[PDB]
Structure formats: structure tokens, C-alpha cells
Amino acid sequence: YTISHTGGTLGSSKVTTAANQTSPQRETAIIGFECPRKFAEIEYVGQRDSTRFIPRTTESITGTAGDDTVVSLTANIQPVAGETAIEDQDYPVAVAYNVTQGVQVDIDAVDYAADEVTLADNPADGDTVKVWPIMGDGDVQFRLVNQFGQEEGRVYPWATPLYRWHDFPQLKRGREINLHGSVTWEENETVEVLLDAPQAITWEDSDYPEGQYVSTFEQDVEITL
Amino acid sequence: YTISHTGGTLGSSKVTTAANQTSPQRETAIIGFECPRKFAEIEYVGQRDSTRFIPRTTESITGTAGDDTVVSLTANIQPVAGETAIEDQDYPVAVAYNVTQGVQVDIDAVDYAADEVTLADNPADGDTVKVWPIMGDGDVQFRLVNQFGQEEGRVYPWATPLYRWHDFPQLKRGREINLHGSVTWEENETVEVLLDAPQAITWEDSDYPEGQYVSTFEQDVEITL
Amino acid sequence: GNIGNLSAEKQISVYDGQPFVDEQDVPADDPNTPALTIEGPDGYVIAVDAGTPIAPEFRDSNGNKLDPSTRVIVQKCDRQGNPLGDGIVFNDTLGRFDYEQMRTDPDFMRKTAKSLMIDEREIVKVFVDIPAGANGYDADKSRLTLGDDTSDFGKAVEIVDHDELSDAETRAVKA
Amino acid sequence: GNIGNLSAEKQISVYDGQPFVDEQDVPADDPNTPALTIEGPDGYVIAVDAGTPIAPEFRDSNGNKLDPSTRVIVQKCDRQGNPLGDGIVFNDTLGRFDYEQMRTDPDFMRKTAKSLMIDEREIVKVFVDIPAGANGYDADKSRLTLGDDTSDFGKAVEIVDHDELSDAETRAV
Amino acid sequence: GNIGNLSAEKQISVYDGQPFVDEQDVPADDPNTPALTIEGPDGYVIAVDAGTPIAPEFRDSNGNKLDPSTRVIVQKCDRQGNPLGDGIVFNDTLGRFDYEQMRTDPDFMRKTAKSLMIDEREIVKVFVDIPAGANGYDADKSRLTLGDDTSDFGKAVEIVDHDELSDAETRAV
Amino acid sequence: GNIGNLSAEKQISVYDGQPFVDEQDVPADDPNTPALTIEGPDGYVIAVDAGTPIAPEFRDSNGNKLDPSTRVIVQKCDRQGNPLGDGIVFNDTLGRFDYEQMRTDPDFMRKTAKSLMIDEREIVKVFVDIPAGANGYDADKSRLTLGDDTSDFGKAVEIVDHDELSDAETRAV
């Protein structure tokens, strides 16, 4: 006797784990989904139940004369759903915020190739601005952990690239992501979502304007009770 | 399917109503219990499900030299389950408040014969005091009222004297009041409790120290779902 | 929207202020004068089973008690006001009585001996045999209690309208 | 002058303005307060077959959309209106709902996963779990459109008055 | 050095300081907050029958008795935390009790109205519906008693471990 | 805490970043350069059915898409790097490709023609026939996605380890 649910950034309980990786090119555990006492079991079926991932990183710049262009963001950028115009995407490629004025900034233009952008707000000298663009390169996959602290194993050991999550219109049916493999939980067990990449994903940065979370991870699943 | 609930001063929702009587003696409609959309029906059975009812009134005085004693309060000051000392009782017969001082007061001595009392602090000339003794003599009973604002009938109509509620230890089993008769509400309909007495009931006097409800009326009842 | 249906044998208690009763202040030592006078209610019938309590709240004018040596008597009467000698239910004192829980604790409920059944126009009286030194009877400040209907204790008092040949036999109370 | 005999299963869709659905301005992070309360019509039965769309066009008082990471839940409750735990028809987020065409393209529509059945008195509640930072919920400037009764896509909501054996089996709750 | 073997049905009581029950101080007038929570002990099964007493000594931080007009509700919930509406056991006030002897004299002991059963994970919650005038609700200077495993009066709560046919019948919820 | 075992038949996708493929810079006047070298894994085996999607996101160093007069071919070779000639899967121009949505809409997906199989050593190569002008080719600012393992649309590439008779007949080139 089962129904469906979503596991997510917050999800059915505040016992999940939300951390960030390292810059040395060595994978870490971004997220930890631990089961509660409430439910007997959680089950995920690749090819059946969708998954969504909006990753996003953090950068910073200092203000000075002519500082309307933003440099290479250390990030292999792509457009969203293959579409470039920020005003016509399912979600922004990137956003930024002046701290000295304490507001959001709109973006004017892009160079996907050079990984650079162009803004309207020429800041002052000594100014401070922060940017949250989507994450580029990255290899992700799932992992299981028992109630002890042990790696039982991965799932379908072929890590998908990060950028495919950006590449498609994730909301539209048929194009949504359905990874592979299968997996089952239990009460004190903890699945983890793991990632390897150069750049530091972030969350819960207060200065972000369009929500209390820069970036999200969601997953449809089936549940016993 | 059935359960047991309590109808109360506030009950399952704030469609309940409460109001006072007149100074001449007449059956006035004191408190009305109206049924919600949440339930389907209600029942109350005398001789099975009990009822508690703590009435109290208001008087007041202005102070002067020598005013330790307070006069006959326009009611017969009964005992409390046959008891005399305020400390020893299930509830006070009498409470007092110095509003000029903005404080609660306690009692020194009592005289049920002359229906008088005598207090601790002689309040000042021009001082202001309010007092809440129990309701004196009077008669009380029930009534049904349909959705049309119209009567439908009374319930084991032997109007009960007031003093009997004060004369018992209402909590003690056996001594708990059980009235008589039966009743069955419907959805949008109301029952009323009515009263005749030479004094004015009070609730929600802001200056009262013990709680927000000097007087109460509560009843064990039976509900469908 | 029902209220339901009732019975005949209503269960009550009895006291002074009801409107089939007469209080009457009393001097020192005139026993023949009636303190309390029940009459029948003119149409109903009263019944008092035996083993039935009394709670007399008897006091003076000045709030205090009376002499413990006093005798309270409850006596049945004719339909006129005369005693009957026979048909007494109670003759005892007040020193044996305690007022602060006389209607609460059944172990404090001092009780009757005989049963009793009263018809339409009949009378019951209370009488008070006293010494000469006492301060009398201030009925405003004294009272009486007899039975209870809300509890399950002592025994409540029965009242009815008329049920037929049971009434024909009840009317055999005639001497 | 005929009317045409019509099936009493009337196929409609549902919104807030109707006089059996009440709204409630929500604070920041009260996921137990119901934003919307759907009381039965006091005389009919509603049926929602599985595979049924939603369009919960939610915004704030200033009019901007809520946070995408919001959780949105539809749940049946008892006749008192307390959640049954089980009996859910929907559980997902707002980011999964492109407001521009969430009710336009079947290729974008979000559908139910369960059947459902509401009597004259049974209650539905729409709960919203939000972080702290958001600008609440202004029902005066937001709305809901449950189902479709207009297009050859999607599905609708069946409403019926009382028929005998249908009621006989409907009271098998 | 013997002790005597035991029947499986252990007659006990329940109190606040046990490791399958949790307290939580409530604000002024929040009923939906569960003051007290009970959960199954993970391996045993509890059975309460009706006529089970309560000494629910609820007090404030200063310990003084609350507004007697306060309402108490006791209810079984699902395995998640959602009350049922069905399966309520108790609903009464405070001033119907008398803290001085509410657990002492049987004339002062209120009790339940129905039976109850707790599996390894089943949950019970206790709610308190209160006006604004409360001085809060301090659990440290308050407590609860359920069951009676000391006298001929009242009853005790039965507890068992898992036995085959007993648990097979138990899981018919 | 089971996971669910799998057969050998891994349904996957292919692109530049995996460690059995190497991109290479390409000037603009050679249809004979190994643009991509796709070498076997040395112990596992790949299979592709005809009717398999391609997404050849080729641009220049300045990010612009190249002249769609350019042609592209994907082709099998021997275990050394010599094209077999036959066994071609693809030959078309970039003008038939729409980088904005070429890997999303089935109505834009250019697919394979003939099936294909790659043993532990068999090589696939890509060849690009270009005119004189269009600014060469940079693979670091370009990529490719071969097959699709996420949708119901398109198909995925099959991979296996060594199972006996399957390999015995996979040697049937």
C-alpha cells in the first residue's frame, strides 16, 4: 500500500543534510536524505519518477571605473533549454546583487562562449557585488548509507554531467530527467547525492533576492505510507 | 458513530453567545449554544451527562472612613458545598478589587445572617472598589430555538433553583449536578439557557484578577463524529 | 429538534420557600403552634419513602443555633390543621444534627422511619418543643431541606399527577 | 421545445470565487494553517478522477510569484476538517508550474495521481509550506483553477445530485 | 533466588518522565500544538481500556493553576503526526478537576470514555485550547498521570511484547 | 536497504567528457581528420540500434555555429584507426540542426540510419567536411551528446560486460 511524494531541499522532515563540496577535485556529498521514523520505507525508481536539480554557485566582485562587464566566471556556461534571453527562460542563467546599495541588479547581455556578461549598473569604486550563476561542469550521482555510517554502494555507476539538468526544459513532460537504477531506504538509513566539480555550490545566502534558497534539488518518489 | 464532548463557555466555535438579564425579574435568555457545520447532530441527556454552572455578579462601592464592612449585597449569601471559610471551598463566595489601587483584595470576615462581609484594607475616602459575589436566588432552565428564531420547547421543565448549584460540591461524583430531560440539536439551530434573578450577571470584566471569565456554564454531552 | 418524553414519578427535594408551604415565626415554648406547614398542592400527590433524610437549618434571630435539647417533630395532620398522634414520622433533637453537610454526606443524613403518602388537601406540620429560655425561631434566617433529586443518594421524593385505581386505594388513607 | 436529457454528472472546473470555497491570508511559515478550505456544497457530491490538472496561480501582495521551493499540497480532511494523513492527491512545488502556460500546454500540465470523492460535507484543504523570508500569500491577488471544462485536453470535475444506488455505495466510506 | 514468571500483560501506569513520551511548553492560545506526545516503544504494544483515570496537573511557570475555562483534548494520530478526529478518548476542562485531590478520592477522578491501542509506532497527542490570559504552560512544574497500577480503584494499562496471534489480531486497524 | 540489481544491459548516453573519447582541434579544409576518437573500454562492449539521436553542438572559438554548408559524418574503423568504409551511420549537414532545441523536440532530432556495434577495441571517428572560410572549429567551446538516456523519446546506448554466448556472436562482424 503505497503513494507518491516528493523529497526535496526541505521535504518531509528537517533531518536532511545540506552541505557544500571542496575545491580540490574530489567528490563530496552535497545532500543527505535520511528516512524518519514516520515512514516504513522510501523507494526511488529510475526511468519512472522524475528528478529536478537547479544548481547554482557564488562569485564576488569589487567595484571601480568601467566595471560593467563581468569577467570569466570560472564556469562553462550554457543557455537554459538552449535559449539565451534571460527574460524568456524557465529560470535565470544568473542573477547578481549589489551589497553597497543592497539591491538586485538586472543583466543586460551575455557571452556564453567567453563566459562573460554585461550589466547596466556601473558600480562605484570600492563597491561590492555578488553573483549567483548556474553551475557548469559537474559529475553527480547517488549513494547509499546504512544506519552505521558505511557506504553500501552507489547506484548505476555512470555519473551524469551537471549541464544536462540545465540543457532541457525540466518542467515539460517527456523532457524531464529520469536517471537510472533503483534504490530502497529504511528508517535510520541515509541516501546521499554526491558531486564532483571545481566550483562551490551554495545555499541559504541571505542577500539573494528571489528566495531564501539560491538553488534546489527535488525528486519524485514512491512511499509506503 | 458517537463520542463524548463538552459544551462550554466558548465551545467548539465562536458562534456561541452570552448576554445578561434585567433588574426587574424576568426570564431572560442568558447563554446560547448554536450548532456548527462541522458536526451532524448533538445530544444532551439529563441524569447521564452532568452540568456545571458557576454564576457570579457585580456590585461596587466608594470608600470612606470606617468602611471595613460591606452591607447586604442584595442577595442571600449561601455557603459553598455547605462550607464557610473561603480558603476551604471549591471556589470563593466573594472576590474584591480595589480599582484605584488596581489590585486584588482578600476577605477578613463574613456574616451570612445579615448577608454582609468585612474586608482587610479600609479603602480611602473616594477610593473605588468592585466586588463579585455569587448570584443569589433565582430560577434557571433550558429552551430550544430553531433556525427561524422560534421556540420549540423546554426540557423537563422544572426550573431549578439557583442556590442548589452553590449548595453542592459540583465536581464530586454523586454530588455532581444532573439535570433531567433530553434534547437533540440540528445543524443551524440553537439551544438557550435562561434565568430570572434580582441581580445582574457579569462576564469578561477586565478588572477581574482570577481569569477572563468570572462565571461559566459547561456541560458533558454526546456527539456524532 | 426533539426534547423527548417524561414520566409521572418526578423526583424532587422539599424546602421552605416552595409555594405549598408556610413558614411561621414561633415564641419560646408554644409547641402547638406550627412552625412549618406543608399542605398538599391541590391536584398532585406526594410520596416520601422511608429511610429518608432531613436537613433542618434551624437557627435564631441572632444567627446562632437553638438549644440542643429541643425536640423537632414532623407529624401528619388532618385536612384542617389538627394533629393526629399516630402517623408521626420523626421525633428527635438538634444536638444530634449538624448543618454544614446535612444534605451532602449520606452518613450525616439523619433519616426517617416510616413511609408516607400525602393526598390533595392533606397537611403536614412541623412542631418544636422547647424550653422557656430560648430565642425562638426566625424563619427568614432558618430553613429546611428534605431529599435531593440530582444525586443518586438519600432518596428523592416522589410527586405525581393521578393514576387511577392506585388512587382509589391511596384514598383509603381515610380513617 | 425540448432541453435534451442530460447526464447529471456535470463536468466543470473549480476556483475561489464560488460560495463553497473560502480563502485565508497566510503568514510566512505556518504550513498547518489552510490557505483554502473547500466545503461541500450541501446538496451534491463531487468526484475527481485521477489524472486531473491544477493551476494554482499563487503570488504575493506585491504581486510577484512566491518562492519556487515552496511546497504545495492538496489533502482531504475529515468532516471536522483535520488532515487524514493519507488520501493525498497532490504533492509538489511551484517551480514545477510555469504560470504562463501551466493550464495551456498539456506538455506542461501537472496532473493528479489519485481519484477522489467529496460528499455534501467532506472537506479539502490546500496547505502551503514556505520558508520564512517569503511575502506570505495574498489570496485577493492569487487564485486557483482546478480542472478544465473547456478544451479537448485535460479533464474535468464531476458533480452530481443524489441518485439511489450511487448514494448507497457512496456512503461506503 | 527466584522471582516468579509473569503473564505477558503487564499492568502499569504512565507519567511524563518516561522514554517514550515527550513534553513541550505551549504558548498562550495555540491548540494545534501538541503539549504532550506519546509514541510506541518499538517492540511492545500498549492497550488502554475505557474508564482509565487522569491526573493532568497542568500549571504555569509560577505553578499557579491555570484558567479553569481551558479545554483539554486527547487524541490518537497517524504514524505521521496528523490527528484523526475519530478515535478521540477525552475532552474536558480543568476546573472540572481539583488538583488537591483529583487523583486521591474516586469521587474526584475523571476518566476516559473509550479504549485504545498503541502499536510499535502509533502516536497519541494532547492538545490544550486556551484563552489569551494564560501565563503560559510550564511542563517542568507540571506533570501528568495516566493509569492506576497501585490500588483496586481505576485501572492499569496493559503492555505486552510481540506474540503471534495477539499481534495478528492487533494489526487489524 | 536493498538497491536492486541490474543486468549487464546498461542504458546510457555518450559525450566528450567520458574517459574513452578524445576531442581534437580541426581546421577548416580537411574531411579526413579524427575530429573525435571514440575508443572501446577494453573489456566492455557497446551496442547502438539504428534510429538513435545525435546532438552535435559544434561552434567556433568565438562561439558562433559554423557554416551549415559543412557536412558531418560518423563512421566505424578498425582496431588501428583505419576507416572500414562501410558501416556508416550518418552523413548530413549542420543546416539540418537547430542548436536551440535540437536535443529536445523529437521533431528536430536527427537520428541514425544503420545499427552499430563496438567491441573492446573497435573505433568510431567523426569527420567534418568544411569550406575555406568558417573560422575552423574548437571542441573546448563545443560538445556532443550521442544518444539519450533520460527521456522516453530517443533511445540509449547499450553496454555490457563479457557474457559468454553473447560475446561469441558479437564476434560475428
Side-chain angles (χ1 to χ4, degrees):
Chain A
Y1 184 69
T2 77
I3 64 179
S4 62
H5 274 96
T6 296
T9 298
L10 320 178
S12 58
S13 303
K14 297 181 194 170
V15 305
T16 191
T17 316
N20 47 8
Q21 80 286 37
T22 73
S23 279
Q25 279 289 342
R26 183 205 46 66
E27 58 85 7
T28 78
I30 300 301
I31 276 158
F33 275 35
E34 190 165 347
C35 195
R37 311 208 72 161
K38 301 189 283 183
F39 308 151
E41 49 172 12
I42 305 178
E43 194 179 8
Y44 175 67
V45 173
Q47 314 307 102
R48 189 182 74 194
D49 302 334
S50 89
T51 312
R52 190 175 146 201
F53 191 44
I54 309 304
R56 213 185 277 286
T57 191
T58 305
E59 292 291 351
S60 58
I61 53 177
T62 311
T64 173
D67 185 2
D68 275 304
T69 291
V70 195
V71 305
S72 64
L73 323 174
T74 66
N76 180 234
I77 313 313
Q78 307 294 292
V80 194
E83 175 55 85
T84 77
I86 65 186
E87 57 260 44
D88 300 337
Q89 322 193 342
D90 311 279
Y91 60 94
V93 57
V95 190
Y97 184 101
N98 183 1
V99 161
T100 301
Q101 295 176 349
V103 303
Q104 163 171 350
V105 166
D106 51 41
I107 299 163
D108 302 354
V110 190
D111 192 314
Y112 285 80
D115 317 286
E116 278 161 334
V117 288
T118 302
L119 300 171
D121 180 306
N122 197 330
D125 213 328
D127 199 332
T128 309
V129 182
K130 273 145 72 190
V131 192
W132 295 290
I134 59 180
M135 194 68 95
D137 199 308
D139 302 358
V140 308
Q141 44 187 350
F142 292 1
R143 190 169 80 177
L144 193 68
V145 184
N146 59 3
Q147 60 268 24
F148 298 76
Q150 310 181 326
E151 165 158 26
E152 265 286 8
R154 320 302 195 74
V155 181
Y156 199 79
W158 291 101
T160 313
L162 194 74
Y163 52 73
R164 263 191 218 162
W165 295 84
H166 297 328
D167 289 334
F168 294 7
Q170 300 183 328
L171 317 184
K172 167 181 175 232
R173 65 179 175 179
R175 326 303 178 288
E176 74 294 11
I177 314 313
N178 309 322
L179 279 157
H180 295 266
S182 49
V183 52
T184 299
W185 272 266
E186 187 55 25
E187 175 161 18
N188 283 321
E189 312 198 290
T190 317
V191 158
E192 295 166 334
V193 170
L194 286 63
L195 162 60
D196 208 303
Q199 273 183 138
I201 193 176
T202 50
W203 287 312
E204 295 183 13
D205 200 320
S206 56
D207 309 330
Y208 180 90
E210 297 185 356
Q212 290 291 120
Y213 298 90
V214 300
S215 171
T216 54
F217 171 78
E218 303 92 330
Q219 188 155 320
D220 303 77
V221 309
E222 192 172 51
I223 301 295
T224 306
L225 311 160
Chain B
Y1 192 95
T2 79
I3 60 181
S4 159
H5 274 171
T6 299
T9 294
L10 313 181
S12 60
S13 155
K14 294 184 177 170
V15 304
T16 302
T17 311
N20 57 6
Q21 76 282 33
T22 72
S23 286
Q25 324 304 279
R26 186 149 47 85
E27 177 173 358
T28 81
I30 287 305
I31 282 162
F33 291 10
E34 191 172 356
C35 164
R37 287 214 71 185
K38 302 188 291 193
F39 306 140
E41 48 266 356
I42 308 163
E43 303 178 6
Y44 163 66
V45 171
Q47 310 303 100
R48 187 189 71 164
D49 320 297
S50 184
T51 305
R52 190 187 167 204
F53 171 49
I54 312 310
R56 210 180 277 264
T57 192
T58 289
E59 290 282 11
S60 60
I61 55 179
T62 314
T64 185
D67 198 349
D68 313 334
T69 304
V70 166
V71 306
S72 278
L73 304 173
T74 74
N76 211 28
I77 316 313
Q78 296 294 129
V80 182
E83 296 272 34
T84 81
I86 299 144
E87 49 261 41
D88 301 357
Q89 325 194 330
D90 286 28
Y91 45 82
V93 73
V95 186
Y97 197 100
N98 187 310
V99 180
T100 297
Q101 298 183 352
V103 312
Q104 183 169 4
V105 195
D106 274 307
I107 287 144
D108 289 27
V110 189
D111 182 284
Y112 287 21
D115 288 355
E116 308 209 324
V117 299
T118 315
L119 297 166
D121 278 24
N122 195 311
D125 304 67
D127 195 326
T128 298
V129 163
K130 281 181 76 169
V131 185
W132 300 260
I134 58 141
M135 199 63 80
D137 201 319
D139 75 334
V140 291
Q141 57 159 307
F142 288 4
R143 176 167 82 190
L144 178 59
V145 183
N146 62 356
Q147 58 264 36
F148 308 140
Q150 307 175 336
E151 191 159 343
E152 285 287 339
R154 319 308 200 68
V155 184
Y156 198 93
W158 272 57
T160 294
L162 200 76
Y163 63 87
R164 282 209 189 169
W165 292 82
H166 283 302
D167 281 22
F168 284 27
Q170 313 204 4
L171 283 68
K172 187 183 162 195
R173 197 177 66 176
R175 317 307 190 287
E176 81 302 341
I177 305 308
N178 271 104
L179 299 170
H180 301 259
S182 71
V183 68
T184 294
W185 281 259
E186 286 155 54
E187 172 156 30
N188 291 313
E189 288 78 346
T190 307
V191 166
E192 186 64 25
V193 170
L194 307 100
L195 156 61
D196 203 340
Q199 280 180 157
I201 194 167
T202 55
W203 315 289
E204 313 188 356
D205 196 331
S206 67
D207 311 349
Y208 200 77
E210 315 183 331
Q212 282 73 28
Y213 301 85
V214 294
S215 161
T216 50
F217 176 85
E218 323 296 301
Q219 183 156 277
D220 296 68
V221 309
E222 215 171 35
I223 312 303
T224 297
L225 306 166
Chain C
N2 191 25
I3 51 166
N5 298 290
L6 317 182
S7 179
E9 286 219 329
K10 289 82 143 169
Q11 305 284 321
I12 67 162
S13 84
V14 172
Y15 52 87
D16 58 357
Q18 292 210 288
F20 61 109
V21 197
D22 307 313
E23 261 175 347
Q24 188 165 344
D25 273 14
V26 185
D29 61 330
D30 182 17
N32 304 325
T33 308
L36 299 197
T37 283
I38 298 95
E39 54 185 343
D42 315 325
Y44 288 124
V45 159
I46 281 156
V48 170
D49 204 318
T52 313
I54 317 173
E57 208 167 348
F58 289 17
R59 306 180 182 283
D60 67 342
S61 298
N62 305 340
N64 296 257
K65 207 142 185 150
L66 301 151
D67 197 294
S69 66
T70 318
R71 280 186 292 151
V72 168
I73 298 95
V74 175
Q75 171 166 203
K76 182 175 147 219
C77 307
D78 61 353
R79 291 168 188 192
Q80 314 310 135
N82 301 334
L84 298 172
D86 199 69
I88 287 170
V89 307
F90 201 103
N91 187 310
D92 217 332
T93 68
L94 304 173
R96 306 162 152 292
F97 275 32
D98 274 338
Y99 288 13
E100 316 313 321
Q101 58 202 321
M102 48 183 159
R103 55 181 83 81
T104 302
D105 300 66
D107 313 332
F108 283 70
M109 280 194 166
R110 172 62 70 81
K111 306 206 304 316
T112 44
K114 197 189 278 180
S115 57
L116 175 55
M117 317 290 186
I118 313 307
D119 80 342
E120 277 196 58
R121 297 289 189 289
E122 171 166 56
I123 282 161
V124 171
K125 271 169 176 178
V126 189
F127 286 134
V128 194
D129 298 357
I130 322 192
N135 298 113
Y137 196 113
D138 208 310
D140 282 330
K141 320 204 170 185
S142 283
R143 70 169 194 158
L144 191 147
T145 293
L146 189 83
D148 175 21
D149 49 9
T150 73
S151 84
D152 299 330
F153 284 71
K155 182 62 175 72
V157 192
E158 285 175 13
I159 279 176
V160 286
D161 206 302
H162 283 300
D163 289 5
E164 44 259 22
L165 309 191
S166 51
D167 212 313
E169 212 170 12
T170 297
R171 191 69 83 74
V173 74
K174 55 181 170 67
Chain D
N2 202 306
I3 59 174
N5 293 179
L6 318 180
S7 66
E9 282 173 358
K10 280 76 158 189
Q11 318 178 4
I12 75 169
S13 51
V14 178
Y15 52 95
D16 63 343
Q18 308 185 303
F20 63 99
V21 180
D22 303 358
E23 303 176 300
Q24 186 177 353
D25 275 322
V26 188
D29 58 343
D30 190 358
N32 296 327
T33 287
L36 312 183
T37 69
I38 301 95
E39 172 47 61
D42 205 338
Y44 300 96
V45 160
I46 300 155
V48 168
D49 193 306
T52 313
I54 307 163
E57 213 183 333
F58 295 169
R59 294 155 191 289
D60 79 315
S61 305
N62 311 346
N64 266 329
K65 185 164 154 181
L66 304 173
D67 192 294
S69 54
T70 307
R71 275 194 276 169
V72 169
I73 294 99
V74 172
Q75 200 190 327
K76 172 172 180 200
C77 295
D78 64 350
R79 305 206 179 185
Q80 296 292 110
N82 301 258
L84 308 176
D86 200 6
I88 292 155
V89 308
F90 185 91
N91 199 342
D92 217 341
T93 75
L94 297 170
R96 302 286 190 74
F97 285 69
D98 172 283
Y99 276 46
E100 320 316 325
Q101 43 173 14
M102 57 159 169
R103 48 167 92 86
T104 299
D105 199 329
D107 212 335
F108 282 68
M109 272 182 184
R110 291 273 156 172
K111 299 187 275 278
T112 43
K114 279 230 171 182
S115 54
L116 182 62
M117 195 270 286
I118 308 302
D119 78 333
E120 301 191 43
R121 290 284 201 291
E122 278 258 23
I123 291 156
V124 184
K125 293 190 161 182
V126 194
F127 285 120
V128 193
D129 184 4
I130 310 196
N135 305 121
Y137 178 97
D138 207 325
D140 304 337
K141 313 202 167 221
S142 291
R143 76 191 167 196
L144 193 142
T145 302
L146 167 47
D148 197 306
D149 40 15
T150 80
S151 279
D152 303 289
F153 293 114
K155 281 294 218 206
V157 192
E158 281 150 22
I159 287 160
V160 291
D161 209 312
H162 308 140
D163 296 355
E164 183 264 3
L165 214 69
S166 83
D167 276 87
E169 260 287 3
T170 295
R171 296 290 183 90
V173 70
Chain E
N2 205 325
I3 57 175
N5 291 320
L6 276 63
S7 164
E9 293 205 330
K10 277 69 168 159
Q11 276 86 346
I12 75 167
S13 59
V14 166
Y15 61 98
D16 62 333
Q18 300 167 295
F20 55 103
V21 168
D22 297 332
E23 273 162 335
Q24 191 169 7
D25 285 355
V26 187
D29 57 355
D30 190 314
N32 301 319
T33 292
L36 313 178
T37 294
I38 303 96
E39 61 195 350
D42 193 301
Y44 304 100
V45 167
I46 296 154
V48 176
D49 304 63
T52 317
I54 311 187
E57 186 175 352
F58 304 148
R59 303 166 172 288
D60 77 321
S61 298
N62 302 270
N64 296 262
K65 197 155 177 170
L66 320 189
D67 194 297
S69 64
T70 306
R71 267 204 280 178
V72 177
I73 294 167
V74 186
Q75 203 187 139
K76 162 164 187 189
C77 306
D78 57 1
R79 306 192 188 196
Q80 286 68 234
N82 307 264
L84 294 167
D86 197 327
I88 295 154
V89 300
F90 194 94
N91 163 39
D92 212 325
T93 73
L94 276 289
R96 292 258 177 195
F97 307 128
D98 183 323
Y99 276 12
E100 313 318 315
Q101 55 183 345
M102 59 177 186
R103 56 175 91 81
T104 285
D105 195 320
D107 306 323
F108 287 71
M109 305 183 196
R110 312 291 159 185
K111 306 179 276 288
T112 51
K114 299 208 177 172
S115 74
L116 197 64
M117 185 269 293
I118 321 296
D119 80 333
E120 59 267 58
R121 294 281 191 290
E122 264 169 337
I123 284 164
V124 172
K125 295 189 174 185
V126 194
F127 296 131
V128 196
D129 206 7
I130 315 171
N135 298 308
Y137 164 81
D138 201 314
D140 293 324
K141 304 213 174 180
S142 295
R143 71 205 196 180
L144 187 137
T145 301
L146 174 60
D148 204 316
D149 49 2
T150 68
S151 304
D152 198 358
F153 308 96
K155 301 195 178 175
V157 190
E158 316 195 346
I159 277 171
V160 285
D161 206 319
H162 293 159
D163 289 355
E164 188 84 35
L165 318 186
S166 293
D167 65 45
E169 175 265 347
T170 304
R171 299 287 162 85
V173 304
Chain F
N2 206 314
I3 65 187
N5 315 273
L6 313 181
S7 161
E9 47 162 12
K10 273 70 177 162
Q11 316 186 2
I12 72 152
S13 51
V14 172
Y15 49 89
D16 60 349
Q18 282 165 357
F20 58 99
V21 177
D22 291 326
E23 276 161 314
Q24 194 177 7
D25 273 25
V26 176
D29 47 3
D30 182 80
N32 321 306
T33 298
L36 314 185
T37 62
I38 297 89
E39 175 49 31
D42 196 358
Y44 300 88
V45 167
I46 299 156
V48 184
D49 194 354
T52 312
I54 304 151
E57 193 187 315
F58 305 152
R59 308 155 190 287
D60 67 336
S61 316
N62 293 307
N64 305 281
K65 193 164 158 172
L66 304 176
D67 189 355
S69 67
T70 312
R71 273 192 317 151
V72 75
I73 294 166
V74 176
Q75 190 170 216
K76 181 170 174 193
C77 310
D78 71 328
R79 308 190 174 200
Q80 300 289 297
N82 298 282
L84 185 136
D86 211 330
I88 292 159
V89 309
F90 196 90
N91 186 305
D92 203 355
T93 42
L94 306 171
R96 317 309 206 194
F97 291 81
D98 177 305
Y99 280 24
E100 285 158 41
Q101 53 178 356
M102 54 182 201
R103 58 171 87 79
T104 70
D105 188 359
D107 300 333
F108 284 73
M109 286 211 163
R110 308 305 188 171
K111 308 194 291 298
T112 46
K114 300 203 167 183
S115 77
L116 184 61
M117 179 277 311
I118 313 297
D119 77 329
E120 293 72 22
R121 299 288 187 286
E122 269 158 344
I123 288 162
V124 181
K125 284 193 173 189
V126 177
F127 289 110
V128 191
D129 194 22
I130 314 150
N135 303 316
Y137 169 97
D138 178 287
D140 310 348
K141 299 204 172 203
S142 284
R143 75 196 162 175
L144 188 139
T145 295
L146 172 53
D148 283 334
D149 66 351
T150 68
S151 316
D152 193 62
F153 303 150
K155 285 173 184 267
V157 184
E158 297 166 8
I159 277 173
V160 284
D161 208 324
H162 280 197
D163 286 18
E164 292 87 346
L165 320 189
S166 57
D167 291 29
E169 308 328 308
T170 299
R171 192 50 149 80
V173 173

